[PDB]
């Protein structure tokens, strides 16, 4: 095993579930626009989907789906997006998925965290709903951030391993090639197009020089639902990002020579899902995400 | 071990002297000590059939309220059956307890509403620095009850808090009308 | 021969319980003293408490606390059930206050801490005593409080209220003498407030020889505060003795109160692997919800209406009470049953409210979600009644 791998095999998912939490669920017959509003209303990123006909949880609705819908059916700021307004979750699931393959990926509360970290990486999803086999009820929605936050406290207790001592280039952790980025002047629609094709959680915003001046993430997109500005995707990411409430600190960055330990502290402190690796010039060399780091500690 | 099983012999009535005689003591006279109108002795008896009688102030009698047996010679004794089920507490409570309304049919004041149920867990605002999915710890009395939102845009919103072990989950369902 | 059970020789009567009598007992070898509660089996059958007795025995058996009377063993016989309990020689707190008068502030606080510690421990174990009063609080040779006589107690269930009137009028909360429903920890707290007063003043806060006057005094929440009482403890009494149960102090509130915290021993209140996991977790305009469905219409009207709508949806029901129904729906897909309770309540004179409460299933792993099936079951009915 690994030092940290032993820990993850020990603890059940129940260990992560908070004392009292809120869970939102959507009937698949629900108008898909109303659903994305609900996610905003209740302040949650994802929700399980329930089919009354099948009496089962068929799948999960996330902000990625909102991005897929916007990009597919957006035509111009002058014409409303009919499919967003008219469709139901089941209708768009049938359109989006021609294949009958994709099942709902769930985990039991008794199952260990290691098994949970595996399943997130296997299907490459960021949401794992925890379902009790006996009751049939969905208990909690597990995420990368929840899990790393848990480990971080445990990582401090255990004796410092050599991995943490080594620098990020030596460690080879993260994605250093084929980086999806956008210009300051890039339209949101084009940015959305890039989300769909690269399937990445966030796009660094770079200037003419190559330096990162900002970051545009799938989370920033949900703001379109919030302010009901989704009808106009022609605006630049820069104008769209002005709407972020938190007055902006410079983009969170890390360096190649910096230790894995240093980085995990910076990520977990800031609660952002990824870090941007850069040259002194601020030119983007790559991305380190939670999924990368957990894939390191799950295997390595 | 299972040969010693505690049995209460109680005579309800007045007397200067009360004695117990049975098969178990070879029909000797065992004096019963008194509390008010109760004379008692407690004895360990083997599982099986046992016959007994009382001697109360110079008169042989049996307890009329307890079971009796009658000999072909005309002797009238009390009889008692020692059962192993009598000596385990929960087994004996099971026997004491022994001693289909589902089909729907064609067919006072209403209890005043307990104010506990008007504490709505979702109407409670939480802090801006914490995860929005998180909630306050519920009163156990609030659990399993149904809460709802006024129907709007042809959509109904239902909610209830249920417990799983030491954890609680408040579930919201969005269903169209 | 003497009266002897489990090697203990039965002595003098200490008092009379709900069942039988409680007697002292003395070990034939060591001379150890115990308290033996005698429960006559034909008596517990007469008023059928048999299950209520079995649950009291199960619960009390597990209890281990210094300020609650311990249940050592339960011994069964053909005629009788013997409960062997710890014996404390000091007797009732009530008798103590009668003989010695009010206790000073430090002694009152010391005892009130021990008692509330016991009450809390019961509540943490989902048990409400409901008979709390100085007659039910005993004392050992060292003046440690011991809560006794759980005969009127009850276990707290999820989503359930208790209607049972209990305890002495002097120690009963306004909702209890008014016959209203209650969750029950707030009732033990009210009683504990009356006990606290008795300790400090040597008298009862609500007492009258005229019973209707006594009930009014209780529902008014008005009582006399002697000049010698610390203003600090007066505020604590005011909070514990709040008429409105929603405004009434909780055990958390009392532990935070300054008068209570003084001199407080560490052992009294609870606050390995399981503890560590909990610590980790803890370290890591708007919509307006409302309960059930309301109708300004009449109670016989709204009851008939529900039954009609239940029948329309093919559901089956039992009328357990005029205003309380148990419903069972067959699920077409899973071919299983989903049960819920309906109760009507009165919001005010002009308004009534129907309540939906899910009933936990018997079943081991089965298809679909209980919580959702519960929602769908209600949804169908609500659409009709809306
Ligand atoms: C009214 C009544 C009638 C019968 C009843 O059931 C029983 N009452 C019982 C009384 C006794 C008992 C125990 C001990 C002594 C005794 C004898 C000598 C010296 C000291 C003693 O305590 C006397 C009687 C025994 Cl061993 C078993 C008993 N079972 C209970 C009750 C009742 O509910 N009292 O509140
Ligand atoms: N637990 C899950 N089971 C099935 N599909 C999922 C699950 N989580 C996410 N998805 C889908 O995977 C895609 C990516 O979602 P995200 O996890 O937000 O990147 C979306 O189209 C979701 O509908
Ligand atoms: N902007 C990006 N360009 C290229 N790869 C990325 C980018 N963001 C994340 N990744 C990689 O995509 C995978 C999933 O990351 P995430 O979408 O952040 O969960 C990881 O291997 C990341 O290193
Ligand atoms: N590396 C970063 N630097 C600055 N802000 C970020 C970074 N990553 C995410 N954010 C912000 O965090 C929010 C979304 O976080 P997440 O969905 O966890 O990526 C958005 O407001 C982003 O602009």
């Amino acid at each position: 095993n690994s030092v940290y791998t032993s820990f993850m095999k020990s603890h059940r998912c129940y260990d992560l579930i908070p004392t009292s939490s809120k869970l939102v669920v959507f009937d698949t017959s629900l108008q898909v626009k109303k659903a994305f509003f609900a996610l905003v209303t209740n302040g949650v990123r994802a929700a399980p989907l329930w089919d009354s006909k099948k009496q089962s949880f068929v799948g999960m609705l996330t902000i990625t789906d909102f991005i897929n819908i916007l990009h597919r059916y957006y035509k111009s700021a002058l014409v409303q997006i009919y499919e967003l307004e008219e469709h139901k979750i089941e209708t768009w699931r049938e359109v989006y998925l021609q294949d009958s393959f994709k099942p709902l990926v769930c985990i039991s509360p008794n199952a260990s965290l290691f098994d949970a970290v595996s399943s997130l990486i296997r299907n490459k999803i960021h949401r794992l709903p925890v379902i009790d086999p006996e009751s049939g009820n969905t208990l909690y929605i597990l995420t990368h951030k929840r899990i790393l936050k848990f480990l971080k406290l445990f990582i401090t207790e255990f004796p410092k391993p050599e991995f943490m001592s080594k620098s990020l280039e030596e460690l080879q952790i993260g994605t250093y090639a084929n980086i999806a980025m956008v210009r300051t002047t890039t339209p949101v629609y084009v940015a959305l197009g890039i989300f769909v094709q690269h399937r990445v959680s966030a796009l660094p915003v770079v200037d003419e020089k190559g330096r990162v001046v900002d970051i545009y993430s799938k989370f920033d997109v949900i703001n379109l639902a919030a302010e009901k500005t989704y009808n106009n995707l022609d605006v630049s990411v820069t104008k769209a990002l002005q709407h972020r409430s938190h007055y902006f600190e410079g983009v969170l960055k890390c360096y190649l020579h910096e230790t894995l330990e240093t980085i995990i502290n910076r990520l977990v402190e800031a609660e952002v899902h990824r870090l941007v690796v850069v040259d002194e010039n601020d030119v983007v060399k790559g991305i380190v995400s939670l999924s990368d780091i957990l894939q390191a500690l799950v295997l390595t | 071990p299972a040969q010693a099983r505690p049995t209460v012999f109680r005579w309800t009535g007045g007397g200067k002297e009360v004695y117990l005689s049975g098969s178990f003591n070879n029909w000797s006279k065992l004096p019963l000590t008194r509390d008010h109108n109760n004379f008692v002795a407690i004895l360990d008896l083997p599982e099986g059939e046992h016959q007994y009688k009382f001697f109360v102030d110079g008169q042989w009698t049996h307890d009329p309220s307890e079971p009796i047996v009658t000999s072909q010679l005309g002797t009238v004794n009390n009889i008692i059956q020692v059962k192993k089920t009598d000596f385990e507490v929960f087994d004996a409570l099971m026997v004491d307890s022994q001693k289909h309304q589902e089909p729907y049919v064609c067919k006072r004041a209403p209890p005043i509403l307990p104010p506990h149920l008007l504490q709505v867990i979702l109407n409670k605002d939480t802090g801006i620095s914490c995860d929005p999915a998180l909630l306050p710890e519920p009163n156990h009395v609030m659990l399993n009850h149904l809460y709802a939102l006024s129907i709007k845009d042809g959509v109904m919103v239902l909610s209830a808090t249920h417990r799983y072990k030491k954890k609680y989950v408040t579930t919201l369902l969005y269903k169209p009308i | 021969g003497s009266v002897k059970i489990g090697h203990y020789i039965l002595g003098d009567t200490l008092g009379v319980g709900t069942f039988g009598k409680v007697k002292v007992g003395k070990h034939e070898l060591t001379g150890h003293k115990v308290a033996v509660k005698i429960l006559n089996r034909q008596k517990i059958r007469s008023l059928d408490v048999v299950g209520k007795i079995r649950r009291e025995i199960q619960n009390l058996k597990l209890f281990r606390h210094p300020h609650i009377i311990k249940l050592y063993q339960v011994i069964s016989t053909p005629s009788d059930i013997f409960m062997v309990m710890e014996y404390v020689s000091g007797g009732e707190l009530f008798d103590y206050i009668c003989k010695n008068g009010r206790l000073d502030e430090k002694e009152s606080r010391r005892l009130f801490q021990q008692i509330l510690s016991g009450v809390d421990y019961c509540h943490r174990h989902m048990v409400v005593h409901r008979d709390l009063k100085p007659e039910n609080v005993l004392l050992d040779a060292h003046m440690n409080a011991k809560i006794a006589d759980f005969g009127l107690s009850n276990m707290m269930s999820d989503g359930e209220f208790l209607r049972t009137s209990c305890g002495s009028p002097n120690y009963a909360a306004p909702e209890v003498i008014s016959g209203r429903l209650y969750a029950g920890p707030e009732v033990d707290i009210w009683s504990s407030g009356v006990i606290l007063y008795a300790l400090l003043c040597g008298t009862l806060p609500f007492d009258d020889d005229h019973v209707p006057t006594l009930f009014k005094k209780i529902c008014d929440g008005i009582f006399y505060t002697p000049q010698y009482l610390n203003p600090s403890v007066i505020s604590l009494l005011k909070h514990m003795l709040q008429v409105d149960p929603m405004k009434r102090a909780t055990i958390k509130d009392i532990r935070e109160h300054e008068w209570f915290k003084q001199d407080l021993p560490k052992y009294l209140f609870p606050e390995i692997d399981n503890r560590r996991i909990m610590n980790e977790a803890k370290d890591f305009r708007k919509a307006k919800w409302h309960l059930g469905i309301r109708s300004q219409s009449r109670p016989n009207d709204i009851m008939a209406e529900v039954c009609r709508a239940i029948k329309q949806l093919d559901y089956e029901w039992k009328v357990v009470n005029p205003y309380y129904l148990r419903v069972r729906r067959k699920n077409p897909v899973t071919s299983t049953y989903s049960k819920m309770s309906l109760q009507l309540y009165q919001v005010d004179s002009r308004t009534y409210l129907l309540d939906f409460r899910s009933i936990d299933d018997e079943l081991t792993p089965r298809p679909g979600s209980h919580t959702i099936e519960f929602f769908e079951m209600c949804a169908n009915l609500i659409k009709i009644l809306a």
Side-chain angles (χ1 to χ4, degrees), chain C residues 62-79:
Chain C
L62 301 168
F63 279 28
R64 176 190 180 178
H65 182 71
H67 302 297
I68 305 185
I69 289 292
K70 286 177 195 168
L71 174 60
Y72 293 143
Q73 190 56 267
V74 182
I75 301 174
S76 194
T77 73
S79 52

Side-chain angles (χ1 to χ4, degrees), chain A residues 14-15 17-27 29-30 34 38 41-44 50 52 109-110 132 135 138-139 146, chain B residues 121-122 129 131-138 152-153 155 157 161-162 164-176:
Chain A
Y14 176 92
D15 292 17
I17 309 181
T19 303
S20 195
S21 66
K22 184 167 70 176
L23 176 73
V24 183
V25 166
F26 296 138
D27 196 295
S29 65
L30 180 73
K34 177 85 178 180
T41 290
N42 295 120
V44 189
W50 176 262
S52 297
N110 307 314
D132 172 49
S135 61
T138 298
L139 299 182
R146 186 71 164 169
Chain B
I121 194 162
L122 298 180
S129 65
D131 201 306
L134 300 174
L135 286 173
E137 179 188 353
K152 189 164 190 184
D153 305 329
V155 177
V157 193
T161 308
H162 288 80
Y164 181 87
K165 308 192 168 187
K166 293 297 187 185
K167 310 291 175 55
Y168 310 89
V169 181
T170 309
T171 295
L172 293 70
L173 181 61
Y174 284 81
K175 191 172 177 56

Side-chain angles (χ1 to χ4, degrees), chain B residues 4 15 23 26 34 73 78-79 114 116 124 134 140 152 173:
Chain B
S23 59
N26 274 314
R34 179 171 61 206
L73 309 185
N78 284 126
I79 191 172
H116 305 76
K124 300 182 173 189
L134 300 174
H140 78 278
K152 189 164 190 184
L173 181 61

Side-chain angles (χ1 to χ4, degrees), chain C residues 10 24 51 55 77 131 140 277 332 370:
Chain C
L10 291 190
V24 63
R55 75 176 39 100
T77 73
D131 209 13
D140 66 358
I277 65 176
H370 180 50

Side-chain angles (χ1 to χ4, degrees), chain A residues 138-171:
Chain A
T138 298
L139 299 182
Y140 188 65
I141 302 178
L142 215 51
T143 69
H144 299 263
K145 198 193 310 144
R146 186 71 164 169
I147 299 174
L148 180 51
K149 186 50 185 187
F150 178 42
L151 291 221
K152 191 275 166 201
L153 297 183
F154 176 76
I155 295 182
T156 307
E157 298 294 355
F158 182 83
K160 306 170 175 180
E162 177 185 32
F163 299 98
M164 320 312 286
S165 205
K166 286 179 172 296
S167 92
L168 193 44
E169 192 171 32
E170 325 177 36
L171 298 169

Side-chain angles (χ1 to χ4, degrees), chain C residues 235-289:
Chain C
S235 67
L236 172 58
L237 289 163
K238 290 183 79 173
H239 198 183
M240 298 180 74
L241 293 181
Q242 284 288 329
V243 168
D244 194 344
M246 306 308 299
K247 296 188 169 190
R248 182 173 316 146
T250 67
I251 290 199
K252 171 170 174 294
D253 290 326
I254 299 162
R255 292 170 71 179
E256 297 169 0
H257 194 281
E258 286 302 311
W259 188 87
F260 190 85
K261 283 162 60 185
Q262 294 184 346
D263 298 330
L264 183 59
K266 296 180 181 297
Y267 82 93
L268 273 181
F269 288 86
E271 302 180 351
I272 56 165
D273 183 5
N274 292 336
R275 296 175 62 186
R276 180 180 180 180
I277 65 176
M278 293 178 70
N279 191 32
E280 295 302 317
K282 183 178 179 180
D283 185 4
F284 297 108
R285 291 194 179 185
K286 182 56 184 181
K288 193 173 172 184
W289 290 86

